[PDB]
Design a protein around this nucleic acid. Structure first.
Ligand SMILES: [Mg+2]
Ligand SMILES: [Mg+2]
Ligand SMILES: [Mg+2]
Ligand SMILES: [Mg+2]
Ligand SMILES: [Mg+2]
Ligand SMILES: [Mg+2]
Ligand SMILES: [Mg+2]
Ligand SMILES: [Mg+2]
Ligand SMILES: [Mg+2]
Ligand SMILES: [Mg+2]
Ligand SMILES: [Mg+2]
Ligand SMILES: [Mg+2]
Ligand SMILES: [Mg+2]
Ligand SMILES: [Mg+2]
Ligand SMILES: [Mg+2]
Ligand SMILES: [Mg+2]
Ligand SMILES: [Mg+2]
Ligand SMILES: [Mg+2]
Ligand SMILES: [Mg+2]
Ligand SMILES: [Mg+2]
Ligand SMILES: [Mg+2]
Ligand SMILES: [Mg+2]
Ligand SMILES: [Mg+2]
Ligand SMILES: [Mg+2]
Ligand SMILES: [Mg+2]
Ligand SMILES: [Mg+2]
Ligand SMILES: [Mg+2]
Ligand SMILES: [Mg+2]
Ligand SMILES: [Mg+2]
Ligand SMILES: [Mg+2]
Ligand SMILES: [Mg+2]
Ligand SMILES: [Mg+2]
Ligand SMILES: [Mg+2]
Ligand SMILES: [Mg+2]
Ligand SMILES: [Mg+2]
Ligand SMILES: [Mg+2]
Ligand SMILES: [Mg+2]
Ligand SMILES: [Mg+2]
Ligand SMILES: [Mg+2]
Ligand SMILES: [Mg+2]
Ligand SMILES: [Mg+2]
Ligand SMILES: [Mg+2]
Ligand SMILES: [Mg+2]
Ligand SMILES: [Mg+2]
Ligand SMILES: [Mg+2]
Ligand SMILES: [Mg+2]
Ligand SMILES: [Mg+2]
Ligand SMILES: [Mg+2]
Ligand SMILES: [Mg+2]
Ligand SMILES: [Mg+2]
Ligand SMILES: [Mg+2]
Ligand SMILES: [Mg+2]
Ligand SMILES: [Mg+2]
Ligand SMILES: [Mg+2]
Ligand SMILES: [Mg+2]
Ligand SMILES: [Mg+2]
Ligand SMILES: [Mg+2]
Ligand SMILES: [Mg+2]
Ligand SMILES: [Mg+2]
Ligand SMILES: [Mg+2]
Ligand SMILES: [Mg+2]
Ligand SMILES: [Mg+2]
Ligand SMILES: [Mg+2]
Ligand SMILES: [Mg+2]
Ligand SMILES: [Mg+2]
Ligand SMILES: [Mg+2]
Ligand SMILES: [Mg+2]
Ligand SMILES: [Mg+2]
Ligand SMILES: [Mg+2]
Ligand SMILES: [Mg+2]
Ligand SMILES: [Mg+2]
Ligand SMILES: [Mg+2]
Ligand SMILES: [Mg+2]
Ligand SMILES: [Mg+2]
Ligand SMILES: [Mg+2]
Ligand SMILES: [Mg+2]
Ligand SMILES: [Mg+2]
Ligand SMILES: [Mg+2]
Ligand SMILES: [Mg+2]
Ligand SMILES: [Mg+2]
Ligand SMILES: [Mg+2]
Ligand SMILES: [Mg+2]
Ligand SMILES: [Mg+2]
Ligand SMILES: [Mg+2]
Ligand SMILES: [Mg+2]
Ligand SMILES: [Mg+2]
Ligand SMILES: [Mg+2]
Ligand SMILES: [Mg+2]
Ligand SMILES: [Mg+2]
Ligand SMILES: [Mg+2]
Ligand SMILES: [Mg+2]
Ligand SMILES: [Mg+2]
Ligand SMILES: [Mg+2]
Ligand SMILES: [Mg+2]
Ligand SMILES: [Mg+2]
Ligand SMILES: [Mg+2]
Ligand SMILES: [Mg+2]
Ligand SMILES: [Mg+2]
Ligand SMILES: [Mg+2]
Ligand SMILES: [Mg+2]
Ligand SMILES: [Mg+2]
Ligand SMILES: [Mg+2]
Ligand SMILES: [Mg+2]
Ligand SMILES: [Mg+2]
Ligand SMILES: [Mg+2]
Ligand SMILES: [Mg+2]
Ligand SMILES: [Mg+2]
Ligand SMILES: [Mg+2]
Ligand SMILES: [Mg+2]
Ligand SMILES: [Mg+2]
Ligand SMILES: [Mg+2]
Ligand SMILES: [Mg+2]
Ligand SMILES: [Mg+2]
Ligand SMILES: [Mg+2]
Ligand SMILES: [Mg+2]
Ligand SMILES: [Mg+2]
Ligand SMILES: [Mg+2]
Ligand SMILES: [Mg+2]
Ligand SMILES: [Mg+2]
Ligand SMILES: [Mg+2]
Ligand SMILES: [Mg+2]
Ligand SMILES: [Mg+2]
Ligand SMILES: [Mg+2]
Lengths: 197, 386
RNA sequence: GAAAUUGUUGAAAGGGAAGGGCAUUUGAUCAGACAGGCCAGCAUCAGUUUUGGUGGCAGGAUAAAUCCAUAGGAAUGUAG
RNA sequence: UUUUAGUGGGCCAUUUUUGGUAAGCAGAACUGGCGAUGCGGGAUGAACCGAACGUAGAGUUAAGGUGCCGGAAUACACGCU
RNA sequence: CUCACCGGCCGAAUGAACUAGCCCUGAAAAUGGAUGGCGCUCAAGCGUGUUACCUAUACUCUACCGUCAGGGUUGAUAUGAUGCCCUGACGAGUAGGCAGGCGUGGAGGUCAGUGACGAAGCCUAGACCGUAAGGUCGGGUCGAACGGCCUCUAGUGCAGA
RNA sequence: GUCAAGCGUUCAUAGCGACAUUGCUUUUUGAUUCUUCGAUGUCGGCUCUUCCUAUCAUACCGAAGCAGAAUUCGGUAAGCGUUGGAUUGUUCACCCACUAAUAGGGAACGUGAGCUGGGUUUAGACCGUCGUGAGACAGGUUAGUUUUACCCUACUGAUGA
RNA sequence: CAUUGCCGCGAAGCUACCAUCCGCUGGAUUAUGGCUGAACGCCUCUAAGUCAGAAUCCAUGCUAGAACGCGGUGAUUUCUUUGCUCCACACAAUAUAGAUGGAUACGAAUAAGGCGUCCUUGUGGCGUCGCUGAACCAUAGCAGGCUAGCAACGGUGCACUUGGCGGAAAGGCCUUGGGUGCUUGCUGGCGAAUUGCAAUGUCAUUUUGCGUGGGGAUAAAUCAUUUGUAUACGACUUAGA
């Protein structure tokens, strides 16, 4: 219902997130996905690494510059998974894909904005316990992505800043909850409690 | 069906496309790994290829049959006047790669490097860096804010240097401007080194040392459009061939119904960017040193220049680098010498080279004499007027 | 003084053809009316349907159960 | 009852069959089809499933489906991997 | 030093032969590649069950077009009787047959038809009628003839050879 | 590949492996006649690229009837190599060598507007056999025109709004 | 003159395993060998976990650089039919992949957490919460007018301003104070009609132009000529008041 929806992609399964995001884009919702290096794919790492190398094998034989373009970053693996769930050769699907932004880490503006989850796509809600899974940053590093260490450094910095934000936000909501508790047991607050409020 | 006889490929598919390079100055696409315990040094230097000569030296190679005997070795001479440090550039690490944050230039730039910013210098009002020069003018606070941004951010510090091509016997007068990484300690101390060295010159002696393995990065000599016989070294077709011999006979099977990228074709040969590695420095010769070309074993008062000059180059009045062997590019060309990216312990490195003799006869013919004094002593006196 | 083909002007569109069908947007262009025409809304109906709420009946082992009473019993044995 | 056109190269499927190691092979039997035929489904396809067609409207369906491309439940349930 | 054997050691199930579901091994091809793709693992896989939902030119209902059938309709049928009206069913199609129409050159008759105040031709992302073949009109250009209807006649309709 | 009579100085399975039996491949040759007879240039070689793996070599390993050396069986693996000649048009073959090794294949039995034209397969000529003859012979022999790209894509390079 | 007459030498340029020079080191793995270790009181390289390990793979490095990927930086044209840029407000034209109360900021785990409190400050104790955002904030007033008080010294809009933090694309976030309105926290007064029973009933944000008044700056590129480190032509690399 938001003008853009910011999905924190951590702990999400790539296909179950990509079909949901593909339907939101085609239904007209702008979606930005962050922390794409923290995405999950079900099945073991060697399993999914062999899958990527099987994908990496296929290219145009007379010119490898016009082949399937094997994009290596985790946001680009998510983008490739989400293409193919969109008619991207039509104008409508091109306009749908223009509604999507996928990033590794949480860069600016989005680091001071609310991030949501898609519980249809959450790994801890979908996979049976004991089932192995792959983290997309580790898989991307194995197949040639260069920037795992930079994203980890910037995410550690961003989390230090975000925790200093949240300490002040708890310090404020202490006072707000106590001041709402002082207004309780008054003739206005009992009147509001009579109406479910 | 199969090829019926095995032969290896003609040419290397990792040097593709064989196109003309985008500039005459080849790019340094990797710099040495930074150790922040070392002092702040340039990782690279700029120079011009003067030409080759040959040397004699003793060999220190135990187990070789030619141990402690003399060998004749070709050496390339790169004329290296000192570079002028004019800028600094800050680079932050981003998830999309390295990004230049800002550049800080020095207050005064010579017409050599200003001429790089002009296609038509002779018609120009020469306004380059005139409003930039008025940011130093009050107290330089707008320069120190930018240097503080480079110190605060910028995990990599590169320095802008230009060549002194007027100290150099070329008709060019327009300097080459490059970015050399500052290896060494402490991003802040890199910025301090660069700001100290603004408008100053860095000599090739304080960057390169003798017996150092270095890399040459240069654009090779151009030859224009070339056929496949010399571009890829394919076999020539027999004398009986109709429609030409200097060709690849089969350029593909029927399927895939396309010419493949691995099939050798006529096109541009040369003027390609090449990075050749592990050339040993045999001499770092000073420019303010009569007897550039003398050794401890010869001690004949002679410079590095041959009689008649270097062919198509001219004389060397500057510092130079005598490096072993062959490096890409032809004579007069700007070449970037870089430190070795790895630490080599291969016993062909770590050999301390001492020259016994440097050939200084004319390269404009089959020279017979090393000095005009030797020529006069051999020939006596001629008819030419006194 | 037709077409093919071409120039100029005008209009329009154009990421490895173009052209077409259905439908609409947008632009251009064009026919028309009252002395009731068009386009709509509401009400009450009719025809065809779709989706709810709710009432009364019938059957069966005149449901089986639960519940109630009574007899016997055990164990994954309650209290003593 | 008269008159006359075209045809007299066929092919596929289920079942029954012959020759052949076999064949998208060759040859028969009964029916249904394609040829001669669009439509919905089987991604795609002469023949398969469904259903055969004036022009429209509304409703319900068949076969096939209902993560997303794609209209329709990331339904509900018992397991297996 | 080894065995069918046992107890002061423990503390409740264990062994053997099979049977068949899924999975794995058996399982090797040549351009890069195909459960259609993306992807998917208490699945978006397999086996099964129950509902809901989607949508064919199919079915139901209604309108309109045609066809075929069965009827009605004459003492101003309150003037169209291969006409008008009522009722019902039906509509795929190559090769082919038959019907009803459209168009072109010329002929007989008619409209005492049109026309130098502009015939014919030609152009026209202008209009109207016809399911269509086609027909009609407006504007431009043009300059001498040409149409409707009723019949007659054929050297009568082109995308291909 | 399975089974294992038997061989392997005793010992089924180190290596083998009869009698049977289950497969895979499409580099053999048949089988068929679906496509092409208003023509898809028909053998081999030369040149050049890529692909497969059923691996000859090289890398790392497991097993041996592996003491060492040299071999043999097997695994991952196609990354990288896999030759020079004599004879023959040959493919194939066979020999001399050298090598780490001289593995097997595919790509319209890769490749003729790339070549070559030795062979086969027009018309000339000779022989042998057959035929009365004209003539025949997947029998031998010798001589016999190898056309066109400037178009589109593809590729190699080169500009550019 | 002998279609470069021929012969010897021959610089330059090109060129030759016929000449020289140079051709990097890390990570993850396969096979295989192992460790710990159940299933299965033992055993076991495997089931969970884990070590080593190939000419493999992926990096490093090397080539090109997206001609619709991006960054930084220098200069940006008037005595040149008064041109260029920025700021503000007046009117026009293009449009719009689709404003209509608010994208409302921990991180980690999920066989666990959040919040509050307390101490010995921990992998702590106690209490409480979840069972969805069905929340929270906001929301009354001619699309929101004019006006009068009461209570409070809060809330909120706009500009001015102080200080700080933010480079992953920061282009935002938090502040200090003074103005400047408004306030529905409470109680009053006036107005709204006829848009005639509905017809978004027009209230958003990009491109631009042009008008007015307020600042700011005072260049290059290309052809032509030239070079040869370049080259089929373009292109490239040089030079020229
Ligand atoms: Mg798709
Ligand atoms: Mg958030
Ligand atoms: Mg990596
Ligand atoms: Mg790469
Ligand atoms: Mg081969
Ligand atoms: Mg090879
Ligand atoms: Mg090679
Ligand atoms: Mg090759
Ligand atoms: Mg170029
Ligand atoms: Mg280049
Ligand atoms: Mg110039
Ligand atoms: Mg400036
Ligand atoms: Mg040349
Ligand atoms: Mg050549
Ligand atoms: Mg060479
Ligand atoms: Mg050769
Ligand atoms: Mg040759
Ligand atoms: Mg020839
Ligand atoms: Mg061909
Ligand atoms: Mg070429
Ligand atoms: Mg070429
Ligand atoms: Mg010379
Ligand atoms: Mg005329
Ligand atoms: Mg014409
Ligand atoms: Mg025309
Ligand atoms: Mg013309
Ligand atoms: Mg024209
Ligand atoms: Mg194009
Ligand atoms: Mg209009
Ligand atoms: Mg009309
Ligand atoms: Mg009207
Ligand atoms: Mg009704
Ligand atoms: Mg007939
Ligand atoms: Mg026939
Ligand atoms: Mg058959
Ligand atoms: Mg037929
Ligand atoms: Mg049918
Ligand atoms: Mg079906
Ligand atoms: Mg279908
Ligand atoms: Mg199918
Ligand atoms: Mg059936
Ligand atoms: Mg039908
Ligand atoms: Mg849907
Ligand atoms: Mg079983
Ligand atoms: Mg596939
Ligand atoms: Mg497919
Ligand atoms: Mg599929
Ligand atoms: Mg599925
Ligand atoms: Mg199921
Ligand atoms: Mg339905
Ligand atoms: Mg229907
Ligand atoms: Mg009708
Ligand atoms: Mg019908
Ligand atoms: Mg019909
Ligand atoms: Mg008709
Ligand atoms: Mg006639
Ligand atoms: Mg007529
Ligand atoms: Mg007559
Ligand atoms: Mg007149
Ligand atoms: Mg006229
Ligand atoms: Mg005419
Ligand atoms: Mg027209
Ligand atoms: Mg007109
Ligand atoms: Mg006239
Ligand atoms: Mg006339
Ligand atoms: Mg007329
Ligand atoms: Mg005629
Ligand atoms: Mg005729
Ligand atoms: Mg026709
Ligand atoms: Mg025809
Ligand atoms: Mg014709
Ligand atoms: Mg087998
Ligand atoms: Mg034995
Ligand atoms: Mg033909
Ligand atoms: Mg051909
Ligand atoms: Mg293998
Ligand atoms: Mg092997
Ligand atoms: Mg080796
Ligand atoms: Mg290879
Ligand atoms: Mg190889
Ligand atoms: Mg030979
Ligand atoms: Mg021979
Ligand atoms: Mg053969
Ligand atoms: Mg050898
Ligand atoms: Mg094949
Ligand atoms: Mg083939
Ligand atoms: Mg062929
Ligand atoms: Mg062939
Ligand atoms: Mg061929
Ligand atoms: Mg061919
Ligand atoms: Mg060919
Ligand atoms: Mg030829
Ligand atoms: Mg051939
Ligand atoms: Mg011949
Ligand atoms: Mg003859
Ligand atoms: Mg002959
Ligand atoms: Mg004879
Ligand atoms: Mg005879
Ligand atoms: Mg011959
Ligand atoms: Mg001859
Ligand atoms: Mg030919
Ligand atoms: Mg061509
Ligand atoms: Mg030409
Ligand atoms: Mg072309
Ligand atoms: Mg003369
Ligand atoms: Mg003469
Ligand atoms: Mg002469
Ligand atoms: Mg002579
Ligand atoms: Mg060369
Ligand atoms: Mg390196
Ligand atoms: Mg293991
Ligand atoms: Mg293990
Ligand atoms: Mg394990
Ligand atoms: Mg463990
Ligand atoms: Mg390891
Ligand atoms: Mg670019
Ligand atoms: Mg700029
Ligand atoms: Mg708790
Ligand atoms: Mg606590
Ligand atoms: Mg940044
Ligand atoms: Mg309010
Ligand atoms: Mg040159
Ligand atoms: Mg040129």
């Amino acid at each position: 219902v938001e003008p853009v929806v910011v999905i924190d992609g951590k702990g999400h399964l790539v296909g179950r997130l990509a079909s949901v995001v593909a339907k939101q884009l085609l239904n007209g919702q702008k979606i930005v996905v962050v922390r794409a290096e923290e995405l999950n794919i079900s099945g073991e790492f060697f399993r999914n690494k062999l899958k990527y190398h099987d994908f990496l094998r296929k290219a145009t034989a007379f010119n490898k510059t016009r082949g399937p373009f094997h994009f290596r970053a985790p946001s680009r693996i998510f983008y490739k998974a989400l293409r193919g769930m969109v008619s991207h050769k039509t104008a409508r699907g091109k306009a749908a894909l223009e509604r999507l932004k996928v990033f590794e880490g949480i860069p600016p503006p989005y680091d001071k904005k609310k991030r949501v989850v898609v519980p249809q796509a959450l790994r801890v809600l979908r996979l049976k316990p004991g089932r192995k899974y792959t983290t997309l940053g580790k898989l991307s590093t194995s197949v040639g992505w260069k920037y795992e260490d930079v994203v980890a450094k910037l995410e550690a910095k961003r989390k230090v800043s975000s925790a200093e934000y949240y300490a002040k936000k708890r310090a404020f909501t202490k006072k707000v909850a106590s001041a709402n508790a002082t207004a309780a047991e008054s003739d206005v607050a009992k009147q509001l409690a009579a109406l479910g409020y | 069906s199969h090829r019926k006889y095995e032969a290896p490929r003609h040419g290397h598919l990792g040097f593709l496309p064989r196109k003309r390079a985008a500039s005459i100055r080849a790019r340094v696409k990797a710099f040495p790994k930074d150790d922040r315990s070392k002092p702040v040094a340039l990782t690279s230097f700029l120079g011009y290829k003067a030409g080759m000569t040959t040397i004699v030296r003793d060999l220190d190679r135990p187990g070789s049959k030619f141990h402690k005997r003399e060998v004749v070795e070709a050496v390339t001479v790169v004329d290296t006047p000192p570079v002028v440090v004019v800028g600094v550039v800050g680079y932050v690490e981003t998830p999309r790669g390295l990004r230049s944050l800002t550049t800080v230039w020095a207050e005064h730039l010579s017409d050599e490097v200003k001429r790089r910013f002009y296609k038509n210098w002779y018609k120009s009002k020469k306004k380059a860096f005139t409003k930039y020069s008025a940011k130093y003018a009050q107290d330089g606070a707008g320069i120190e804010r930018e240097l503080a941004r480079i110190k605060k951010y910028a995990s990599v510090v590169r320095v802008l240097v230009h060549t002194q091509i007027r100290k150099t016997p070329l008709a060019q007068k327009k300097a080459h401007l490059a970015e050399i990484q500052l290896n060494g300690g402490s991003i802040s101390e890199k910025v301090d080194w660069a700001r100290e060295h603004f408008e100053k010159t860095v000599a090739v002696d304080s960057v390169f040392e003798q017996n150092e393995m270095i890399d040459a990065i240069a654009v090779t000599k151009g030859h224009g459009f070339e056929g496949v016989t010399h571009r890829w070294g394919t076999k020539k077709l027999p004398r009986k061939t109709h429609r030409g011999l200097r060709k690849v006979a089969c350029i593909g099977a029927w399927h895939p119904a396309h010419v493949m990228w691995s099939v050798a074709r006529a096109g541009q040969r040369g003027y390609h960017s090449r990075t050749s590695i592990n050339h040993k420095i045999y001499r770092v010769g000073k420019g303010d040193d009569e007897a550039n070309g003398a050794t401890s074993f010869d001690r004949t008062k002679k410079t590095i220049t041959p009689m008649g000059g270097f062919v198509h180059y001219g004389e060397i009045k500057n510092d130079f680098i005598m490096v072993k062997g062959c490096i890409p590019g032809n004579r007069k060309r700007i070449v970037t010498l870089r430190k070795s990216l790895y630490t080599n312990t291969s016993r062909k490195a770590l050999e301390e080279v001492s020259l016994k003799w440097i050939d200084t006869a004319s390269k404009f013919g089959k020279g017979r004499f090393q000095t005009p004094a030797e020529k006069h002593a051999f020939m006596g006196t001629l008819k030419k007027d006194l």
